[PDB]
Amino acid sequence: HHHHHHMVHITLDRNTANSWLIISKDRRQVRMGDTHQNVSDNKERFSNYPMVLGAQRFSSGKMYWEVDVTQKEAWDLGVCRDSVQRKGQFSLSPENGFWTIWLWQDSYEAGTSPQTTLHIQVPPCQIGIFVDYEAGVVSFYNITDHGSLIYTFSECVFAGPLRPFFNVGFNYSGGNAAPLKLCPL
Ligand SMILES: CN(CC(=O)N1CCCCC1)S(C)(=O)=O
């Protein structure tokens, strides 16, 4: 792909984070803590899952960023509407305002309803995410495999401003403590 020149500097919004997350001082990394991180509750925090939003809002144009997923067993990545549900249980779907892919139990899937199997020969250590607001496209790229395409959501109906979306995943196994990291431009 040749989307690299639309690179944007994403930072994480602490106020949206689940209360167990630890976001680095530079707001570029996030990991699961082993306990509640001693913050007040608010209506923006994702309550049931270890999720956090980027601070940036996009309503036009072309945007690109990269995320490091090295040695994680589970995670979700993509974009979502600014007005997605924060509290309780929900599925990641375009009907609920999410355009995402994930790793779970040794398989990769796109967050359609129902979910779609992905075909990845080289497990990625970094993921590229491209959004074309006007075209209604969200695409995912395997940076470890020379930028190969993972998945394209087309005919997207965003229906609002978009925010970068992250889930570090649960750490029931003791094998999923590693962080998500926003990679430098
Ligand atoms: C289920 N987790 C503990 C927990 O209750 N929380 C952390 C995750 C978000 C909800 C809050 S664990 C064992 O760390 O994956």
Short mmCIF file of all heavy atoms in Angstrom, two decimals, residues 18-20 32-34 47-50 169-172, ligand 1:
data_model
loop_
_atom_site.label_atom_id
_atom_site.label_comp_id
_atom_site.label_asym_id
_atom_site.label_seq_id
_atom_site.Cartn_x
_atom_site.Cartn_y
_atom_site.Cartn_z
N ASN A 18 -11.03 2.06 30.33
CA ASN A 18 -11.40 1.18 31.45
C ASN A 18 -10.46 1.47 32.63
O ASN A 18 -9.29 1.76 32.47
CB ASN A 18 -11.30 -0.26 30.98
CG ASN A 18 -11.55 -1.23 32.09
OD1 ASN A 18 -10.63 -1.62 32.80
ND2 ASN A 18 -12.79 -1.52 32.28
N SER A 19 -11.03 1.36 33.83
CA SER A 19 -10.34 1.74 35.08
C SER A 19 -9.17 0.83 35.41
O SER A 19 -8.40 1.23 36.32
CB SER A 19 -11.30 1.77 36.24
OG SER A 19 -11.84 0.49 36.41
N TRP A 20 -8.95 -0.31 34.76
CA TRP A 20 -7.78 -1.16 35.01
C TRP A 20 -6.61 -0.84 34.07
O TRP A 20 -5.56 -1.47 34.19
CB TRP A 20 -8.17 -2.61 34.89
CG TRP A 20 -9.00 -3.11 36.04
CD1 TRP A 20 -10.08 -2.51 36.63
CD2 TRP A 20 -8.80 -4.33 36.75
NE1 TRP A 20 -10.55 -3.29 37.66
CE2 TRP A 20 -9.81 -4.42 37.73
CE3 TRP A 20 -7.85 -5.35 36.65
CZ2 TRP A 20 -9.92 -5.53 38.60
CZ3 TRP A 20 -7.99 -6.46 37.48
CH2 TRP A 20 -9.01 -6.54 38.41
N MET A 32 -2.94 -3.58 30.32
CA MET A 32 -3.79 -4.07 31.44
C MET A 32 -2.98 -4.01 32.74
O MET A 32 -1.86 -4.53 32.82
CB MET A 32 -4.26 -5.49 31.12
CG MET A 32 -5.32 -6.05 32.07
SD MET A 32 -6.93 -5.16 32.01
CE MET A 32 -8.01 -6.49 32.52
N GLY A 33 -3.48 -3.31 33.75
CA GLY A 33 -2.93 -3.49 35.11
C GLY A 33 -3.53 -4.72 35.78
O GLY A 33 -4.39 -5.37 35.25
N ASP A 34 -2.96 -5.10 36.94
CA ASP A 34 -3.44 -6.34 37.64
C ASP A 34 -4.56 -5.96 38.64
O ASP A 34 -5.03 -6.89 39.36
CB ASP A 34 -2.28 -7.17 38.25
CG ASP A 34 -1.40 -7.97 37.27
OD1 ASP A 34 -1.93 -8.49 36.24
OD2 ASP A 34 -0.20 -8.16 37.58
N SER A 47 -16.74 -0.02 30.66
CA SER A 47 -16.86 -0.67 32.00
C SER A 47 -16.52 -2.14 31.92
O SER A 47 -15.94 -2.66 32.91
CB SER A 47 -18.25 -0.44 32.60
OG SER A 47 -19.26 -0.97 31.76
N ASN A 48 -16.90 -2.85 30.89
CA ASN A 48 -16.90 -4.33 30.89
C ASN A 48 -15.67 -4.91 30.22
O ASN A 48 -15.43 -6.10 30.37
CB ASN A 48 -18.14 -4.88 30.20
CG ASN A 48 -19.41 -4.73 31.03
OD1 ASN A 48 -19.69 -3.66 31.57
ND2 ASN A 48 -20.10 -5.84 31.21
N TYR A 49 -14.92 -4.11 29.45
CA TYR A 49 -13.80 -4.62 28.61
C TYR A 49 -12.65 -3.64 28.72
O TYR A 49 -12.84 -2.46 28.98
CB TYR A 49 -14.24 -4.70 27.14
CG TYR A 49 -15.57 -5.35 26.89
CD1 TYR A 49 -16.72 -4.65 26.59
CD2 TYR A 49 -15.67 -6.74 26.92
CE1 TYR A 49 -17.94 -5.27 26.41
CE2 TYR A 49 -16.88 -7.39 26.69
CZ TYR A 49 -18.01 -6.65 26.42
OH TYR A 49 -19.23 -7.20 26.17
N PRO A 50 -11.41 -4.11 28.50
CA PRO A 50 -10.23 -3.27 28.63
C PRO A 50 -9.93 -2.38 27.40
O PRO A 50 -8.91 -2.49 26.76
CB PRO A 50 -9.09 -4.26 29.00
CG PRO A 50 -9.62 -5.59 28.68
CD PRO A 50 -11.05 -5.52 28.29
N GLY A 169 -7.36 -6.49 25.45
CA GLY A 169 -7.78 -7.86 25.79
C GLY A 169 -7.62 -8.18 27.26
O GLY A 169 -6.88 -7.56 28.00
N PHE A 170 -8.38 -9.20 27.67
CA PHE A 170 -8.34 -9.80 29.02
C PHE A 170 -6.99 -10.49 29.23
O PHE A 170 -6.37 -10.82 28.21
CB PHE A 170 -9.54 -10.74 29.21
CG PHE A 170 -10.91 -10.09 29.22
CD1 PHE A 170 -11.90 -10.47 28.33
CD2 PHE A 170 -11.21 -9.11 30.15
CE1 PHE A 170 -13.15 -9.87 28.38
CE2 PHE A 170 -12.46 -8.53 30.20
CZ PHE A 170 -13.43 -8.91 29.32
N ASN A 171 -6.53 -10.71 30.48
CA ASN A 171 -5.29 -11.44 30.79
C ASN A 171 -5.63 -12.54 31.81
O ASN A 171 -4.88 -12.70 32.78
CB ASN A 171 -4.16 -10.54 31.24
CG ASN A 171 -2.85 -11.26 31.30
OD1 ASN A 171 -2.60 -12.26 30.63
ND2 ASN A 171 -1.96 -10.76 32.15
N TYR A 172 -6.61 -13.36 31.52
CA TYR A 172 -6.90 -14.56 32.34
C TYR A 172 -5.76 -15.56 32.24
O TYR A 172 -5.50 -16.30 33.25
CB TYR A 172 -8.20 -15.21 31.88
CG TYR A 172 -9.46 -14.42 32.14
CD1 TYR A 172 -10.15 -13.82 31.08
CD2 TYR A 172 -10.05 -14.34 33.41
CE1 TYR A 172 -11.29 -13.05 31.30
CE2 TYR A 172 -11.19 -13.58 33.62
CZ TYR A 172 -11.81 -12.94 32.57
OH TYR A 172 -12.99 -12.25 32.83
C1 LIG B 1 -11.34 -9.78 33.92
N1 LIG B 1 -10.14 -9.03 34.27
C2 LIG B 1 -10.28 -8.36 35.58
C3 LIG B 1 -11.37 -7.29 35.61
O1 LIG B 1 -12.37 -7.48 36.31
N2 LIG B 1 -11.27 -6.20 34.83
C4 LIG B 1 -10.16 -5.94 33.92
C5 LIG B 1 -10.65 -5.95 32.48
C6 LIG B 1 -11.78 -4.97 32.25
C7 LIG B 1 -12.86 -5.17 33.30
C8 LIG B 1 -12.28 -5.16 34.70
S1 LIG B 1 -8.69 -9.67 33.85
C9 LIG B 1 -8.45 -11.15 34.78
O2 LIG B 1 -7.71 -8.72 34.28
O3 LIG B 1 -8.74 -9.98 32.46
#
